[PDB]
Amino acid sequence: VEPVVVIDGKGHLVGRLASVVAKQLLNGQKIVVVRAEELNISGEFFRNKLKYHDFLRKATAFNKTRGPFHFRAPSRIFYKALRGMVSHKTARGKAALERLKVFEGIPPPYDKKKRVVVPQALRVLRLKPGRKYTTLGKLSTSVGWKYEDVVAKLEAKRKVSSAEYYAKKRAFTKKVASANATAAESDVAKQLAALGY
Amino acid sequence: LRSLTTVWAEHLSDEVKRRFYKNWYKSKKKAFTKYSAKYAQDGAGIERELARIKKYASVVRVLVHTQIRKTPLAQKKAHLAEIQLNGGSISEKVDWAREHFEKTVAVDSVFEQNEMIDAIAVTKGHGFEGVTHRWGTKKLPRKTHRGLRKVACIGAWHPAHVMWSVARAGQRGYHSRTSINHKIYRVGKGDDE
Amino acid sequence: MKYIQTEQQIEVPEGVTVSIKSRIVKVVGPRGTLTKNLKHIDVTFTKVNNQLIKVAVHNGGRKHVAALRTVKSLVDNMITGVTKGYKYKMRYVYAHFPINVNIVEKDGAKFIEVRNFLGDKKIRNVPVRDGVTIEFSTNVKDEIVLSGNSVEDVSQNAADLQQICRVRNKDIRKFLDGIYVSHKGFITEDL
Amino acid sequence: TDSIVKASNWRLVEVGRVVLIKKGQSAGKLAAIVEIIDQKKVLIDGPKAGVPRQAINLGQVVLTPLTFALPRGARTATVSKKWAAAAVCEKWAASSWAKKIAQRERRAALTDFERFQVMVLRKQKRYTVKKALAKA
Amino acid sequence: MAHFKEYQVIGRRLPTESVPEPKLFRMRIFASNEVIAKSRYWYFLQKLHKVKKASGEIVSINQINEAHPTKVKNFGVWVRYDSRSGTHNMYKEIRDVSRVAAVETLYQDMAARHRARFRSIHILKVAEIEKTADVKRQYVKQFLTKDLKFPLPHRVQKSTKTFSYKRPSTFY
RNA sequence: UUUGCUCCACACAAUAUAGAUGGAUACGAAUAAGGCGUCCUUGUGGCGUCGCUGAACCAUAGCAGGCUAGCAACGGUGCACUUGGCGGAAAGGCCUUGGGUGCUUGCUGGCGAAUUGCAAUGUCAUUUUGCGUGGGGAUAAAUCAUUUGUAUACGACUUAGA
RNA sequence: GCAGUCAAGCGUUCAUAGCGACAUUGCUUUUUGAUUCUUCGAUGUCGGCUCUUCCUAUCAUACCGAAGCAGAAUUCGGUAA
RNA sequence: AGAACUGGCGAUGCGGGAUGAACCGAACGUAGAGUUAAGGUGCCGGAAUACACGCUCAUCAGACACCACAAAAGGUGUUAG
RNA sequence: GGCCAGCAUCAGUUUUGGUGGCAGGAUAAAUCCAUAGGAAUGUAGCUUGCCUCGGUAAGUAUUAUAGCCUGUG
Ligand SMILES: [Mg+2]
Ligand SMILES: [Mg+2]
Ligand SMILES: [Mg+2]
Ligand SMILES: [Mg+2]
Ligand SMILES: [Mg+2]
Ligand SMILES: [Mg+2]
Ligand SMILES: [Mg+2]
Ligand SMILES: [Mg+2]
Ligand SMILES: [Mg+2]
Ligand SMILES: [Mg+2]
Ligand SMILES: [Mg+2]
Ligand SMILES: [Mg+2]
Ligand SMILES: [Mg+2]
Ligand SMILES: [Mg+2]
Ligand SMILES: [Mg+2]
Ligand SMILES: [Mg+2]
Ligand SMILES: [Mg+2]
Ligand SMILES: [Mg+2]
Ligand SMILES: [Mg+2]
Ligand SMILES: [Mg+2]
Ligand SMILES: [Mg+2]
Ligand SMILES: [Mg+2]
Ligand SMILES: [Mg+2]
Ligand SMILES: [Mg+2]
Ligand SMILES: [Mg+2]
Ligand SMILES: [Mg+2]
Ligand SMILES: [Mg+2]
Ligand SMILES: [Mg+2]
Ligand SMILES: [Mg+2]
Ligand SMILES: [Mg+2]
Ligand SMILES: [Mg+2]
Ligand SMILES: [Mg+2]
Ligand SMILES: [Mg+2]
Ligand SMILES: [Mg+2]
Ligand SMILES: [Mg+2]
Ligand SMILES: [Mg+2]
Ligand SMILES: [Mg+2]
Ligand SMILES: [Mg+2]
Ligand SMILES: [Mg+2]
Ligand SMILES: [Mg+2]
Ligand SMILES: [Mg+2]
Ligand SMILES: [Mg+2]
Ligand SMILES: [Mg+2]
Ligand SMILES: [Mg+2]
Ligand SMILES: [Mg+2]
Ligand SMILES: [Mg+2]
Ligand SMILES: [Mg+2]
Ligand SMILES: [Mg+2]
Ligand SMILES: [Mg+2]
């Protein structure tokens, strides 16, 4: 659709966000994912906490270096869920992965760029209301991630600025509407009506 | 954490400048010569760097160096190093350090008597070492063929790999250690019989 | 079998003005005010008049319906807590070593400080919660009295103290020592 | 200090609630909820629009804020009588929803030429509004 | 087994020289086609009479359309079913608009709640419950209460593109 | 070591491309609830309104977009200059000022287009590099060998030397 | 070898604190058997020494529930490698 | 370990069962276009994040024949009888 | 007439749509119309008891100031 798709992670389901991201990549669609720390996983926090520790215990016995690597950060968790959906050892595999970029919080470029959502991964649309689920941030911070507080902090500060930007825009689009209204009832306006506009 | 500026003093002791080189004698000693210019203009560009620090900067450290010439050592080439600054406020912190550019700081202004301090240093070296002294492994019995400062079983059959846990001959010494709780019994003073 | 609608009533007295947006509940009456967060629950509130509020659950399961009443319950207690208020009484119990209870404060604290429990050279402490206030009773021996607008904040502060004097390593039927919640009620009397 | 309890005021399944059928031979047509079968099925009838009396799953229909007098389980003729009586059609007609659906239907039916002239018009509008938007 | 039709089937025991005109028996049979429904007929008959398809004949097979296809009805339903451990009789009540609809959901409900596949179920009787308050099972009474209405809270639009630009709204 | 380095500029030349072909079009939060407008007592406030998809919004006509005239506007936009200010999460971008200049399809005119032959992507992007020219700027070091021993199997480490 | 279910009994009294007959359902693969699939142009035996790591059906240590737990001691159970 | 009848493997690739002598499907000259079998269709990965009714929330859920195990016995979890 | 294409008309194979005429059946079943009878998740009216001048409630009341059900045609 567009050269880059920035996805606001907040309110999405890891494995469903993953699954759609994978495909997009494999079809040429560069993606960047933001706020991976506001990502969800079905199931109570504790469950996924244990699920994570299960992953934790697997290591190359003779050398825990060569063995499986346990990335704690929400984006990195995400990549795992995603990478596992890509034949990432083909060249085609590596190729696709590279159009992808995951991020806790929303850092520059992307903040001023617009972000979208993936309805078929949107928790509030998918999960049966009543079911329990998990945020990535709390999970990750629970298994070592060192940076929840800073991201929250930087973001609140981002959110301040952006909420100005909006009010300022909302202000302008009131005028624009006001301008448009005086042009209502003109010949040209009735014409465009007539043609569906 | 990321470093976002370093602001430097104007005049730099040769002693430190020496640390910025591998071949002092031959070299034209041009280190920091352009940087010192940045002072000439009123102050202009150094202020904004200090300024920059103040506006951002969650922590502030100072670059100090040792006066190795006041020391019986032959080594001449001083030791430069960052020290975090823990007194009040970011701003006052960089105010402080700007005040101490070129100016000199005293031991007794950091340590008091009977204070518990820790010591961070690179351990004495010993080079290549047998398993027996490097790991404090039992001596093998005297009767044994092919040597006895060894470990008899380097591993069971599976996992079919020597493992990261078992002891092996290797380097010993020249290790970093942060060792703690050393109480200060004297804070000496040089100008003092 | 998914019940098509079941609802409850939350009665409102001549002193208070409960207000609820999203599912944030503010109850405000003579004794102050409490608020409590219900978002976790999926019920629908409905004013009918300044003395009545309905809360209901559409097409719900057993577990859902079952949480309907406990919301009526929870919100009720905010209303009474802000009208009558709550007052939990505990009375010390000891068969030799006089449990000695005091209130202390490090860094603007208020701590319930228990000394000599079964003699323990150890000095037990329990923070006083905010909302809850504590009079050692005149006229009644070894009685401690906790009181506030939040049932849940006085009951918990009570239970913190009662527990901190659990007995280890003894037959706890013969060693009945402790501080025990001895009466639960309201602050305003006649009722 | 009155009380202020939100609302959350849903459209309801009930006899005489009009629904827009969303897929099927009918689809796009309105119709009325007659009887009510279970939590997921309802009996509909939309005489004025051609849609056959039928059972249908609520999931295939979208509720509209429109309602009228309908005897529960009232047969097709009765349905038609009441409906015209209630003038539901021009009611829905006048709504934004319907006016919106109408719009995109027109947009969709434009000639390439018509399309080209839509542009010339937008340029024209755009000129005097961007002007307006700069004199106050 | 599929989407049902309801058939009358009439079979009758090949005549014999000494007994021409045998007795003629009918069964209403729910099945998705006549090849199945005839088969079911012979199934149940051999469970009641000395016969087998071999020695009998079908006389007629006819589909029986719902009398009032767009009228809502409360059905009582009577099933003999087989479980893993033993066999069981059962009474369910189904509310829909044709007997054929109702037999379709029954078969599902039995599959879902009791893990009863089609082979293991006998429909014993399906009959329209005339007077309400002869409706017994509550999950049906629920839908007979005057001036009844209900919301369908938490709406979910099926997105048609992978990406949305809004952020949705389960309002309704 | 044969006039080498660097930044800006254009020029030639190579070499490429995980895949331009109107526009990645910025609140936040909730979803058993919200956006917007308006009003007020500025609140968990009143009143109006919207959703049911971006099927939108913006842009879009001119030799792949030529050469030209005029009118009505005083608007829009590209460009290089300039004013004041914001942005350190990877700020490397955003906003505001003022004159200059181009274009304007807002409207009305004059010319041009063919033969690329009935289609042939019919070439309009952006990567890195090399070589001259001249518009600014800048004039180091590391290695060997020698040497110390806070180091060392050899390399490595750590000193020292106009 | 280890762990259950039923509960007649045992335990002054009292089935189940702690035990538990007659039965009966299991698990385990450091017992021994049964098998003979791989190795007979060769996979170095028993034990000890040394050293690492793993299992838990936990002997100790941490925190707990139970007792035919007064105290002390002990026993049963849980989270625990 | 040993018989009966057939079909197979051995002697046989090809599609499916991730993997695999014997299961499912189907038996091979070189190829084009079509349709399928067994088995599939969120992503890996061709192919509906299809439709429909229920059920199920597991602090070691479950997830498709051969097949890569679980039983007696219990539950005031929930479902229908 | 060497190479490679484009389109047209056809042929073999095939895939995917639009549309016309018929035959069955309870000569579909329904809706619809007519007609008889009925009931309640009882419409009008009536009664009665509170209730800010009617609205509620609980009684009668079978088409009235809604309608539905069943059979027959
Ligand atoms: Mg900088
Ligand atoms: Mg040695
Ligand atoms: Mg030793
Ligand atoms: Mg030692
Ligand atoms: Mg040893
Ligand atoms: Mg020897
Ligand atoms: Mg004990
Ligand atoms: Mg004891
Ligand atoms: Mg019938
Ligand atoms: Mg490439
Ligand atoms: Mg609103
Ligand atoms: Mg507003
Ligand atoms: Mg409001
Ligand atoms: Mg828009
Ligand atoms: Mg032009
Ligand atoms: Mg022109
Ligand atoms: Mg970036
Ligand atoms: Mg040059
Ligand atoms: Mg030496
Ligand atoms: Mg017995
Ligand atoms: Mg006893
Ligand atoms: Mg006895
Ligand atoms: Mg036994
Ligand atoms: Mg053993
Ligand atoms: Mg053997
Ligand atoms: Mg051998
Ligand atoms: Mg061999
Ligand atoms: Mg050998
Ligand atoms: Mg060997
Ligand atoms: Mg292990
Ligand atoms: Mg254990
Ligand atoms: Mg006893
Ligand atoms: Mg325990
Ligand atoms: Mg261990
Ligand atoms: Mg372990
Ligand atoms: Mg076979
Ligand atoms: Mg052979
Ligand atoms: Mg074969
Ligand atoms: Mg294969
Ligand atoms: Mg398998
Ligand atoms: Mg994969
Ligand atoms: Mg696919
Ligand atoms: Mg089976
Ligand atoms: Mg069982
Ligand atoms: Mg059960
Ligand atoms: Mg050709
Ligand atoms: Mg042809
Ligand atoms: Mg036809
Ligand atoms: Mg009516």
UniProtKB/Swiss-Prot annotation, chain A:
Subcellular localization, as worded in the UniProt entry: Cytoplasm
Gene3D superfamilies, alphabetized: 1.20.5.4280, Ribosomal protein L13
Post-translational note: N-terminally acetylated by acetyltransferase NatA.
Covalent cross-link site, Glycyl lysine isopeptide (Lys-Gly) (interchain with G-Cter in ubiquitin): 175
Entry-linked Pfam families: Ribosomal_L13
Membrane-spanning intervals of the chain: none
Record key words, sorted: Acetylation, Cytoplasm, Isopeptide bond, Ribonucleoprotein, Ribosomal protein, Ubl conjugation
Record-level GO BP terms: cytoplasmic translation; maturation of LSU-rRNA; negative regulation of translation
Coiled coil: none
GO molecular function: mRNA binding; RNA binding; structural constituent of ribosome
GO cellular component, one term: cytosol
InterPro entries: Ribosomal_uL13, Ribosomal_uL13_CS, Ribosomal_uL13_euk/arc, Ribosomal_uL13_sf
Note: Present with 43300 molecules/cell in log phase SD medium.
Quaternary structure and interacting proteins, as annotated: Component of the large ribosomal subunit (LSU). Mature yeast ribosomes consist of a small (40S) and a large (60S) subunit. The 40S small subunit contains 1 molecule of ribosomal RNA (18S rRNA) and 33 different proteins (encoded by 57 genes). The large 60S subunit contains 3 rRNA molecules (25S, 5.8S and 5S rRNA) and 46 different proteins (encoded by 81 genes).
Protein name: Large ribosomal subunit protein uL13A
Natural source organism: Saccharomyces cerevisiae (strain ATCC 204508 / S288c)
UniProtKB/Swiss-Prot annotation, chain C:
Subcellular location as annotated: Cytoplasm
Main location: cytoplasm
Domain of life: Eukaryota
Record GO cellular component, one term: cytosolic large ribosomal subunit
Record's function text: Component of the ribosome, a large ribonucleoprotein complex responsible for the synthesis of proteins in the cell. The small ribosomal subunit (SSU) binds messenger RNAs (mRNAs) and translates the encoded message by selecting cognate aminoacyl-transfer RNA (tRNA) molecules. The large subunit (LSU) contains the ribosomal catalytic site termed the peptidyl transferase center (PTC), which catalyzes the formation of peptide bonds, thereby polymerizing the amino acids delivered by tRNAs into a polypeptide chain.
UniProt subunit comment: Component of the large ribosomal subunit (LSU). Mature yeast ribosomes consist of a small (40S) and a large (60S) subunit. The 40S small subunit contains 1 molecule of ribosomal RNA (18S rRNA) and 33 different proteins (encoded by 57 genes). The large 60S subunit contains 3 rRNA molecules (25S, 5.8S and 5S rRNA) and 46 different proteins (encoded by 81 genes). uL6 lines the binding pocket for eukaryotic elongation factor 2 (eEF2).
Annotated protein name in UniProt: Large ribosomal subunit protein uL6A
Curated annotation (Swiss-Prot), chain D:
Post-translational modifications reported in the UniProt record: N-terminally acetylated by acetyltransferase NatA.
The keyword Transferase belongs to this UniProt entry's keyword annotation: no
UniProt keyword terms in alphabetical order: Acetylation, Cytoplasm, Ribonucleoprotein, Ribosomal protein
Record keyword Ribosomal protein present: yes
Stored Pfam families: KOW, Ribosomal_L14e
Molecular function terms, GO-annotated: RNA binding; structural constituent of ribosome
Location (main, coarse): cytoplasm
InterPro entries tied to this protein: KOW, Rib_uL2_dom2, Ribosomal_eL14, Ribosomal_eL14_dom, Translation_prot_SH3-like_sf
GO term, biological process aspect, one: cytoplasmic translation
Protein location: Cytoplasm
Gene Ontology cellular component list: cytosol; cytosolic large ribosomal subunit; nucleolus
Highest taxon, organism lineage: Eukaryota
Family designation: Belongs to the eukaryotic ribosomal protein eL14 family.
General function of this protein: Component of the ribosome, a large ribonucleoprotein complex responsible for the synthesis of proteins in the cell. The small ribosomal subunit (SSU) binds messenger RNAs (mRNAs) and translates the encoded message by selecting cognate aminoacyl-transfer RNA (tRNA) molecules. The large subunit (LSU) contains the ribosomal catalytic site termed the peptidyl transferase center (PTC), which catalyzes the formation of peptide bonds, thereby polymerizing the amino acids delivered by tRNAs into a polypeptide chain.
Additional detail: Present with 45300 molecules/cell in log phase SD medium.
Official protein name in the record: Large ribosomal subunit protein eL14A
Organism: Saccharomyces cerevisiae (strain ATCC 204508 / S288c)
Phylogenetic lineage: Eukaryota, Fungi, Dikarya, Ascomycota, Saccharomycotina
Gene that this sequence comes from: RPL14A
From Swiss-Prot, chain E:
Keyword Isomerase in annotation: no
GO terms, molecular function: structural constituent of ribosome
Phosphoserine: residues carrying this PTM: 32
Compartments in which it is found: Cytoplasm
One Pfam family cited in the UniProt record for this chain: Ribosomal_L18A
InterPro entries membership: Ribosomal_eL20, Ribosomal_eL20_dom, Ribosomal_eL20_eukaryotes
Cross-link entry Glycyl lysine isopeptide (Lys-Gly) (interchain with G-Cter in ubiquitin), positions: 125, 131, 149
Keyword Magnesium set for record: no
Domain of life the protein comes from: Eukaryota
Signal peptide (from-to): none
Key words of the record: Cytoplasm, Isopeptide bond, Phosphoprotein, Ribonucleoprotein, Ribosomal protein, Ubl conjugation
Biological processes annotated in GO: cytoplasmic translation
Gene3D superfamilies found in the cross-reference section: 3.10.20.10
GO cellular component, one term: cytosol
Family the UniProt entry places it in: Belongs to the eukaryotic ribosomal protein eL20 family.
Complex formation: Component of the large ribosomal subunit (LSU). Mature yeast ribosomes consist of a small (40S) and a large (60S) subunit. The 40S small subunit contains 1 molecule of ribosomal RNA (18S rRNA) and 33 different proteins (encoded by 57 genes). The large 60S subunit contains 3 rRNA molecules (25S, 5.8S and 5S rRNA) and 46 different proteins (encoded by 81 genes). eL20 forms multiple interactions with RNA and proteins in the central protuberance, connecting components of core functional centers that are located far apart.
Additional comment: Present with 54300 molecules/cell in log phase SD medium.
Protein name: Large ribosomal subunit protein eL20A
Source organism phylogeny: Eukaryota, Fungi, Dikarya, Ascomycota, Saccharomycotina
